[PDB]
């Protein structure tokens, strides 16, 4: 369900349903998640750092 991503010294828990657009750029995977009344926050997660759920959809399903 939830993705724990490091910020400075604070690891932030964000839901898989709230990730609006996800894209694999090269060494990193950048993503725009929505959070309230039309105001999108922008996170990032590395290639070894991202575990299994987001990796299976873009290189198997459709």
Curated annotation (Swiss-Prot):
Highly stable from pH 0 to pH 12. It is found in: Cytoplasm. GO terms for molecular function: DNA binding; RNA endonuclease activity. Hyperthermostable. Keywords: Cytoplasm, DNA-binding, Methylation. GO terms for cellular component: cytoplasm. It comes from the Archaea. Pfam families: 7kD_DNA_binding. The modification N6-methyllysine is found at residues 4, 6, 60, 62. Its main location: cytoplasm. Monomer. Can constrain negative DNA supercoils. May be involved in maintaining the integrity of the genome at high temperature. Stimulates the Holliday junction cleavage activity of Hjc. Belongs to the 7 kDa DNA-binding/endoribonuclease P2 family. This is DNA-binding protein 7d. It comes from Saccharolobus solfataricus (strain ATCC 35092 / DSM 1617 / JCM 11322 / P2) (Sulfolobus solfataricus). The gene is sso7d.
